[PDB]
Amino acid sequence: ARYDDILYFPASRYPETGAHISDAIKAGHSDVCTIERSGADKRRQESLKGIPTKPGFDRDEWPMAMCEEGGKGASVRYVSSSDNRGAGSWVGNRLSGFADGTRILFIVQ
Amino acid sequence: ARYDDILYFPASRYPETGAHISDAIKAGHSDVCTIERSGADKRRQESLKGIPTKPGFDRDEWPMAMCEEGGKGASVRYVSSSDNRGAGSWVGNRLSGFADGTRILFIVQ
Hints:
2 copies of one chain form a homodimer.
Chain A: E1 5-8, H1 15-26, E2 32-34, H2 40-47, E3 57-62, E4 75-80, H3 81-95, E5 103-107
Parallel strand pairs in A: 1-5
Antiparallel strand pairs in A: 2-5, 3-4
């Protein structure tokens, strides 16, 4: 199998972030996050390079910076800050139970 | 030797949680957290066996359940929920960039 555990993203609660993750996966980005926290700041620097801030929005990355699959080439979308920060808190809290190296499949229904 | 980085615990901001951590280090519980996130549910179930929830309080563990050092034998104390949840958010944010296996020395100050 290609993953160790599954996370069901709460798209009804964070619909804008959920739409991005679902679209990114539809455009071929991995649906699995192989957790790697050490490289996360550097991946984010590489994914967000040359992408200016849009007031009222944050720059959402899929795959995420905390995944081996993130960084160069990741899909970036401006997402309303309330939605994206709520989503970021949800994901951070959910991934906090998983060790580095664990492969998490994300499902956005 | 025994740690990779140092986290200064902000006992002036979270004084009940800080008092517990300090008291438990003086009772010989490790001041180093070897981060290990996958076992945290199982460790917490071992440390808190027979200790029920109490509205207004959270059950604080030292060593923490997200540390190899936690689980059976940990010091447990009921701490006011606002103090403890503040501490947990602060500690969780400060540790989120460290991969599993990272040894963090805590100094309560």
